[PDB]
Design a protein around this ligand. Structure first.
Ligand SMILES: *[C@@H]1O[C@H](CO)[C@@H](O[C@@H]2O[C@H](CO)[C@@H](O)[C@H](O)[C@H]2NC(C)=O)[C@H](O)[C@H]1NC(C)=O
Ligand SMILES: *[C@@H]1O[C@H](CO)[C@@H](O)[C@H](O)[C@H]1NC(C)=O
Ligand SMILES: *[C@@H]1O[C@H](CO)[C@@H](O)[C@H](O)[C@H]1NC(C)=O
Ligand SMILES: *[C@@H]1O[C@H](CO)[C@@H](O)[C@H](O)[C@H]1NC(C)=O
Lengths: 101, 231, 116, 495, 106, 112, 108
């Protein structure tokens, strides 16, 4: 559980690296939900992308050394939560690649 | 002139893997004519001793015994003897040593009792006791280890197995370790390790320290969550 | 709960989302015995409005309320090309739904520590 | 719950020693933990009365012993000098008292011419006669309401209660006694003398068996009753013998295939074998010949109290291995790793009651008529199991098959072969066709020359999927099957 | 009638479920959840390390159990540690048995 | 507390430490009347590896554990010269070591 | 506590301390009606060690232990000149002297 500390301007873009166990059942990025304290998915292994983050993020899979990359095209200065990657059906406790912005 | 024959405890058989028989002669005149081979039940002997000292702190003679007996010989219990060659004795003296026969084999129970509250109030030193109750045969070997690695034997002083009050064939020892009260009050974990020929892996250990040993308060924090959880 | 209160019949629903490329045989088996095709009715797969490629489907199995009350497992099976073993048996029975009572007991003992 | 099993209820007279044996699942922990016999005090938990670790209480000092038999998997507590005070609820178990793992034993001590016989058994009563008169007018007398209300007519007619089982001479002999028949009859010959009759229900012979295992009951009833049809109850709460197996032919629906019944021996002692025991098999099984079959009174019976451990070392065995008609199967039968095989007998079932298994194959290699050729047993997976195969999918083969061994722990694991007609996974009959689907082909499609002694692989088309397999013996019964390596997949029958 | 959902001996957490039939009808049967948890209260934080500090905070997330630091010794599992036993000059590392009942060699 | 669990017996230890002329005579008594001598056992005095002049002794009493959870008091009487009044007493009971605070804190949530 | 544990009886003490002159009257009354003189025994006044002019006194009431367990609320009354109304009453029972054992803190 490591938490990458990234900074970028209003237009500055951030890339996120997470491990890929090659399971491919579900690998996902999760913004921290501060309004309730749990974790809410933003991108996963099936197209679901958040309405507030509509078409501003994408995922990339690499088998060379098992990369799952989140690329954010835009950035509306909205404080990015703890983008904790995880695997499996259970989002809340599948957390691993901790990232904060 | 003093001569003592000491049998090999199970601790020596376990840790050193060698059964050494010691017939020591001390506090006498020096003649350097010592050559003792531990004689078996028959006339033959196994080996000679080594490392005899021709000097003593009180300016006397000090001798030691040394042997290497195969362990099944100890298990069967054939009688052993030590006979002296030193010329100070007009007639050689024979010391008989052997294992007691087929006893039972119970296993110890180890209990660590922390220092009493009255003793802790004095802020001098606290005594922690290790009680080994229930064993059988009469040999047990207790070591103390302050938080990590071994305490040196000046500190504690375990007694000798002495038949338990009301349990016909079991015994009990007692080893007491004296420490500074701060040392006990900071919160150090003190461990008692018993080696016995009846425990699982011959050894076991029980540790106790400041807050485990009879604490005044229990401080817990159950934090159960997701009480639902698709199970 | 309302249709159970009605006291006539109950309908367990098996719903499959995703469904990348149509393709799915859905079978309803109870106690390892495949149930009659008359009881369970499936649906023609329609798309997803969350993703046009995605395809969802439903299959309802109706029974008497007493059968569900008893506790029979009635678990539905899904067969898709995507399927790892090429089948699923997702799960449900009366006593595995949302609980109504919780008596959590939290026994605390200073000489517990070796869980029987 | 606790896998500990013992007598649910002991009883005895004062001053008589009692022996209470408690069974525990044999594991290293269970074999080396503390064995305790405690008394559930009215308010307060157990007070430990005796322990395996040399402890004995204030009482049980010189009166009691507690021996541990790890090999049997039991421990026996012996209590001598029983008294009326030593009656109540006790627990026998392992580990800590306040912990569960235990069994409850209800001990009751009863205050201390007599004839005591089991129910439904021969008994006879003596009544001293005055010889001064040749034969005074005498009959049988019963102890019911301070005056022998007519129990046998002086003319010799039998009472409706004691009908057709009494003979009188002074000796009176009655057989097939029910539980209510016995009593302290006062008989006169008027020279009144006392007598005593007692009937005791036979104590159950506790049998502690494992889940997914087998049990054997030995109904050694007296030869006399021997020829009367015999049965095997399963005693419920209220007196109703859910008859499981019957010599007459009755069969229990939820016990098909599995149960086998040995034929009666010279005397009258047959054994009933049950396999694949489950948690619902725990209960009192009552024997008893009395032609009808239903356990009815006035019949000699023998009792067992089976307890099925829910923590068993026996591994899971696939209960059914259904297969395609004309194809093949694979039956992996577990056995005790400790003791290796002697004879790997493999059987069938005649019925749910008779069910005499027919050793299709044996370690020697003898095979039955219809399975001559088309069946084999192939030891490996050596590590404590094996794999019996049966190719050429005939329908009639549907049923239950037992993986017998003549080692020690005789689990007779049972497997159900549900045959279903469908596409065959490998190709036909030689002369040499053979075929297995590409999805099934991830392994290594092989050929063996069939020998009832030992399967030996011989050359054929050894390539990739080719139409898929094939057989060639360019220059008997032969097999063309898939192999996993350690284990084995299906077969193929060529000539 | 209890259906034992889980029995985790790493944490003394047993969850069983039951449909209790209070009234003699349908739709009034209470489906339950009997979570039972035994708190060690004297076990160390590191169960296999005797000298570790005492454990005061016990977290139980019923999802990680329905499907790693343990809280209680399993009675069927042999827990051992290594201790130095210096006797003579010869210090030797020996395999002490933390749970002695379960650690007898077969 | 790990011995009471077994619910077999209870071993109470009287530790006299410190005396000079090693002659210490210890008895056990419960409720006045002295306990008969085959319950406890007393070790012979041994020098304290610490204090070079002093000595120590330990006397154990094994009572049936039920008795000990009846909160019965057992007292250790020890006699030695250096003792002011020539004797001294110590009392132990079921509640001598009871913890003062069971400070628990339960956090129950339905949200992970 | 030990006397209660023995269960045979229990003595309640009334420690009337720091009064002058020496004379004083001590009496007991459980519920309202004066307890009979054989039950309790009052000591004679003696000079208090610390304060030099004040003399203390004791009154012991012996009651059954089971009666004490029922919390019968006895009261020891003292009559003395220096008192404002010449009478002061103090009551005790099993309930009195019990601290807050259970301290539950429910928080949302
Ligand atoms: C304490 O915890 C750690 C995990 O948090 C584990 O330590 C390793 O486990 C092996 C098991 O035998 C130990 O023998 C090794 O010594 C440990 N690795 C190391 C650091 O040596 C185990 O739970 C405990 N290990 C300790 C602290 O001795
Ligand atoms: C007791 O537990 C609470 C809650 O975890 C903690 O805040 C406090 O520091 C603990 N106190 C001690 C003495 O352990
Ligand atoms: C008691 O527990 C509370 C909460 O668990 C904690 O905040 C407090 O510090 C504890 N008190 C002590 C003395 O440990
Ligand atoms: C009892 O709980 C309350 C809750 O806040 C706390 O304020 C109080 O200090 C507690 N009492 C004691 C004696 O700790």
């Amino acid at each position: 559980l490591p938490e990458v500390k990234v900074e970028g301007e209003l237009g500055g873009s951030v890339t996120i690296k997470c491990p890929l166990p090659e399971m491919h059942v579900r690998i996902y990025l999760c913004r921290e939900m501060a309004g309730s304290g749990t974790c809410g998915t933003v991108v996963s292994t099936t197209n679901f992308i958040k309405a507030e983050y509509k078409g501003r993020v994408t995922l990339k899979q690499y088998p060379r050394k098992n990369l799952f990359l989140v690329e954010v095209t835009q950035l509306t200065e909205s404080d990015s939560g703890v983008y904790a990657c995880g695997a499996g059906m259970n989002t809340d406790r599948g957390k691993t690649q901790k990232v904060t912005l | 002139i003093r001569v003592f024959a000491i049998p090999p405890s199970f601790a020596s058989i376990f840790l050193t893997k060698s059964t050494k028989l010691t017939c020591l002669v001390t506090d006498l005149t020096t003649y350097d004519s010592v050559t003792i081979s531990w004689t078996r039940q028959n006339g033959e002997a196994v080996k000679t001793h080594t490392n005899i000292s021709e000097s003593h702190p009180n300016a006397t003679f000090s001798a030691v015994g040394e042997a290497s007996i195969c362990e099944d010989d100890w298990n069967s219990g054939e009688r052993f003897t030590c006979t002296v060659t030193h010329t100070d004795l007009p007639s050689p003296l024979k010391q008989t040593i052997s294992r007691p026969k087929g006893v039972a084999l119970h296993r110890p129970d180890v209990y660590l009792l922390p220092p009493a509250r009255e003793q802790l109030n004095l802020r001098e030193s606290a005594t922690i006791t290790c009680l080994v109750t229930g064993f059988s045969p009469a040999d047990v070997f207790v070591q103390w280890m302050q938080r990590g690695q071994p305490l040196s034997p000046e500190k504690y002083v375990t007694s000798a197995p002495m038949p338990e009050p009301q349990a016909p064939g079991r015994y009990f020892a007692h080893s007491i370790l004296t420490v500074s009260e701060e040392e006990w009050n900071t919160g150090e974990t003190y461990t008692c390790v018993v080696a016995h020929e009846a425990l699982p892996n011959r050894v076991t250990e029980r540790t106790v320290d400041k807050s485990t040993g009879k604490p005044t308060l229990y401080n817990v924090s159950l934090v159960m969550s997701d009480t639902a959880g698709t199970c | 709960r309302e249709q159970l209160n009605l006291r006539e019949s109950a309908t367990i629903t098996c719903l499959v989302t995703g469904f990348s490329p149509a393709d799915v045989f859905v079978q309803w088996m109870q106690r390892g015995q495949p149930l009659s095709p008359e009881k369970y009715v499936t649906s023609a797969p329609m798309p997803e409005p969350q993703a046009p490629g995605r395809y969802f489907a439903h299959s309802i199995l109706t029974v008497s309320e007493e059968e569900w009350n008893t506790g029979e497992t009635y678990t539905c099976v899904v067969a898709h090309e995507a399927l790892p073993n090429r089948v699923t048996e997702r799960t449900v029975d009366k006593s595995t739904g949302k609980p109504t009572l919780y008596n959590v007991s939290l026994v605390m003992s200073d000489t517990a520590g070796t869980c029987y | 719950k606790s896998p500990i099993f013992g007598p649910e209820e002991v009883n005895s007279v004062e001053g008589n020693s009692v022996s209470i044996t408690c069974y525990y699942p044999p594991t290293s922990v269970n074999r080396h933990t503390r064995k305790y016999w405690c008394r559930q005090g009215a308010r307060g938990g157990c007070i430990t009365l005796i322990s395996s670790e040399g402890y004995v209480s204030s009482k049980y000092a010189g009166r009691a012993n507690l021996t541990n038999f790890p090999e049997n998997g039991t421990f026996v507590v012996n209590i001598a000098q029983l008294s009326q005070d030593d009656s109540g609820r006790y627990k026998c178990g392992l580990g800590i008292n306040s912990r569960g793992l235990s069994f409850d034993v209800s001990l009751e001590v009863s205050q201390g011419k007599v004839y005591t016989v089991d129910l439904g058994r021969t008994v006879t009563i003596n009544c001293p006669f005055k010889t001064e008169n040749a034969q005074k007018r005498k009959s049988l007398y019963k102890q019911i309401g301070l005056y022998p209300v007519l129990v046998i007519d002086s003319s010799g007619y039998v009472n409706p209660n004691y009908t057709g089982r009494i003979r009188l001479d002074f000796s009176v002999v009655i057989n097939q006694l029910r539980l209510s028949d016995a009593g302290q009859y006062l008989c006169q010959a008027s020279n009144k003398k006392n007598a005593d009759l007692q009937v005791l229900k036979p104590e159950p012979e506790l049998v502690y068996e494992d889940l997914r295992g087998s049990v054997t009951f030995h109904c050694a009833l007296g030869p006399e009753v021997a020829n009367v049809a015999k049965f095997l109850c399963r005693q419920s709460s209220g007196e109703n013998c859910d008859v499981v197996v019957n010599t007459l032919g009755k069969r229990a629906p939820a016990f098909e295939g599995r149960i086998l019944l040995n034929p009666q021996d010279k005397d009258g002692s047959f054994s009933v074998v049950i396999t694949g025991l489950r948690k619902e098999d725990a209960g009192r099984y009552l024997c008893g010949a009395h032609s009808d079959g239903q356990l009815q009174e006035g019949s000699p019976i023998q009792a067992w109290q089976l307890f099925v451990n829910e923590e068993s070392t026996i591994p899971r065995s696939p209960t059914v291995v259904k297969g395609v008609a004309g194809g093949s199967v694979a039956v992996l039968c577990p056995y005790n790793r400790k003791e290796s095989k002697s004879i790997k007998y493999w059987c069938l079932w005649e019925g749910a009651q008779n069910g005499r298994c027919p050793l299709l194959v044996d370690s020697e290699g003898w095979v039955k008529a219809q399975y001559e050729g088309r069946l084999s047993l192939l030891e490996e997976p050596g590590n404590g199991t094996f794999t019996v195969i049966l190719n050429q999918l005939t329908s009639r083969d549907a049923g239950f098959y037992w993986c017998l061994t003549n080692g020690d722990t005789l689990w007779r694991t049972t497997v159900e072969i549900k045959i279903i007609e469908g596409e065959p996974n490998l190709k036909v009959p030689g002369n040499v066709p053979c075929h297995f689907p590409c999805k099934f082909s991830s392994y290594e499609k092989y050929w063996c020359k069939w020998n009832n002694t030992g399967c030996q692989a011989l050359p054929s088309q050894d390539e990739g999927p080719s139409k898929s397999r094939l057989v060639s013996l360019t220059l008997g019964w032969y097999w063309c099957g898939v192999k996993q390596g350690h284990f084995y997949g299906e077969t193929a029958a060529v000539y | 009638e209890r259906i034992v959902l889980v029995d985790n001996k790493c944490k003394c957490a047993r969850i069983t479920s039951r449909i209790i039939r209070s009234s003699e009808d349908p739709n009034e049967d209470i489906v339950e959840r009997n979570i039972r948890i035994i708190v060690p209260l004297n076990n160390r934080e590191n169960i296999s390390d005797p000298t570790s500090p005492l454990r005061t905070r016990f977290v139980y997330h019923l999802s990680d159990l329905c499907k790693e630091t343990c809280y209680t010794y399993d009675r069927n599992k042999c827990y051992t540690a290594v201790v130095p036993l210096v006797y003579g000059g010869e210090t030797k590392m020996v395999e002490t048995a933390l749970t002695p009942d379960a650690c007898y060699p077969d």
